[model samples]
Target: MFKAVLFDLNGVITDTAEYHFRAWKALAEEIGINGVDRQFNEQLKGVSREDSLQKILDLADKKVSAEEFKELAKRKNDNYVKMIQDVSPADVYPGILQLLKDLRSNKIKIALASASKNGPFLLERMNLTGYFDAIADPAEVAASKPAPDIFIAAAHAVGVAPSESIGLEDSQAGIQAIKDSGALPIGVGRPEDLGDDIVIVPDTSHYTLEFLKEVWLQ
Candidate 1:
C-alpha cells in the first residue's frame, strides 16, 4: 500500500562507497589520523557530510574549529567527486532501471532522500535524474539522517503523506530517519543493523517492479 518510493542514492543506487571511503581515508591520513577503518565508513553511511566529519573527529579524538572541519570536508568531497567522475550508465546497479520504469508506469511516485548534496549531480551522471520525481539533500533539510528531516522533505517534495511513502536505505542512520518520518523503511545493505521495518535485499539485482508490487504496492 505504498504510494511513493524514496530511494537512497550512493550504496542503494550505485556502488560509490569505495570512492567515499578512499577519499575520507586519504583526508584522515593527511590530518595525522591512522587507519580510517572501512567499518567506520559503513557506520556513517547515509549521514550528512558535517555529521560524518564530526563523528570522525570524535573517533580520532581530534579537535578542530568549525572552519577547519569545513575545509577538510570540502577537500574530501573534491577528491570523492574526482574519483567518481567517470561513473556512467555502465556503473548503475542491476535492475534499478527496470524497477524505476515500472514504478513510473504504475504511477507510484519515486523520490530520492540522500544526505549527500552531490546526490543530484550523481543522478544526472548516471542518467537517473528523470527517474525521480524529487530529490532531497541534507542542504535542504533542517537536520540530517536519524532526525527525519531529509525524508520529511522528500515526502513533502513528492506531494505524499509520510504514511503513504516507503523509503529504501542502506544505512542504519538512513533507516532511522525514514522510521522517524513515519514511513516504511526498506534496508538494502547491512539490514541486520536496522532491525525490523526493513526489507533486506541481496542487492539491486534482486529488486524488480514485480517485487516492489508484491511487497510494497500490494
Candidate 2:
C-alpha cells in the first residue's frame, strides 16, 4: 500500500513561478543578463535559489565574488518575499485543501519535498503547514533536485521507505529526483515533456484526491 505521498511545492501545491520570475527578471535586468524569459524560469523550476542564481550567471557568462553572489541572492529573495506578502489560505489551489484533508483522512502520511528554503514559510502563510507530516529541510540538505537527497529525506521524515512513497512533481528535475529516490514519480506536465514512461497527471486546476487515490490504489 502507498503509505506516504510527497509533494513538490510550486506547480504541485500552488503557482508562484510568476512571482519568482518577476523577481529574477528584475535581477537579470539589473545585471544586464540577456535571454531570460519564462523558458529559462521553467528550467529553474524545482531548483534552489543558489543554483538558480548560478544558472542566470552562467547564461550571461558573468562571474561574481562570493560576497557579490550572496548580496544578489538576498536582493532577489527580498523582492520575492515582498511579492508574496499577501499570501494566505485563499491562495491554495482550488480543491487542494480538500485533497490534503482526504489524504490525511485515509491515514496516508503527507510530506513536502520542495527544494525551496521558503517552503515552510509559504506553507505557513497559506495556512497549510499543519497538514504536512514533514517538510524536507533545505538548510540541512546539501544537494537539491536532480538529486534524490531531499525526497529520500522527506520519506524518512514521514517514517516511510522511499519505495512505499509516491512523489508528485511538476518539473523535469523533480521527476528525476523521485525516480532516483526509488519512489513512484507522478508527473504533472505534458506526456512528451516528462517522457511517456512516467505517470503524468493534469495541472492542479482540476486537482482532486480521487486522482491520487486511483493512481495509488491501482
Candidate 3:
C-alpha cells in the first residue's frame, strides 16, 4: 500500500529505550523530579531533547534559565551517548532486520525519522547506517513531534509523497506526527496508550510483510 516506510529510531526501529531511560532518569532525578521511572520515560519518546527537558521540568513545575536548559540537555545526551557506544547490529530487534531486507528487495525506500541529535552516531555504531535511504536531521525541526516537520522531511528526503509512505512509531506524539504528515501511522505499543485509530502492533518482533499489508488493509 506504500512505497516507503518511515521508522522512528529509539523505540521503533530498535530498543534504545533503556539507555535513554537510564540517562534521562539520572538527569531528572538529580534535579529531584519525583516519580521518574520507565512509565514516565515513555512521555519523552520521539520527543526532542530540548522538549524532553521541558517535560521533565514540567513535572515539578520548575523553571530553568536558557543556559541551564542547554547545559542539562547536553549532559543528558553525553551520558546517553556513552551508554550506546557498545551498540551493534545485534541490538536490532527480532524480525526487524529481515523486514528491512524484504522492504529493500521489494524496492521500497526506508527512511529513519528521529528527534535525537545523536541519531547518526548511534546508527553508525550499530552498523545500521546503510539501512536508511534518508535520516531526519534533528536540527531541521524546532517544533518536534506532533508538529509533522520531521516526518514530512523524511518523506521528502526519500523522494516520496507523505501519503505514499507508511510510518512506524512507538509514541503518541509520533503517531500524531505521522498522521499530520498524511502517512499511515502504525503504532508499536499498546493500543489504548496510543489513543488513535491507527493500527497498533503489540510487538515489533511479529513484524512481517504479510502482517503489515494485512493490518494496513484492515
lDDT of each: 0.82, 0.86, 0.84
Model 1 bad stretches (over 4 Å): none
Root-mean-square deviation (CA) per prediction: 1.7, 1.5, 1.4
lDDT of 3 by residue, 44-133 (tens): 877888888899999889998999999999899888888888888888877788888888888889998888878888788777888789
TM values, all candidates:
0.93, 0.94, 0.94
- For every model shown, the clashing-pair count is 0, 0, 0
Considering TM-score, which of the candidate structures 2 and 3 is the better prediction for this target? 3
Model 2 residue runs over 4 Å out of place are 205-207
lDDT of 2: 0.86
Cα lDDT tens digits, model 2, 1-218, are 78898889887777776778788889988999966797777778788898889999999899999999999999999989888888888888777788789889999899999888788889999999889999989778878898999999999999999999889888888889999999888887787667788779776754466676577677
Q: Highest lDDT: which candidate?
A: 2
Which residue pairs show collisions in model 3? none
Misplaced by over 4 Å in model 3 are none
Clashing pairs in 1: none
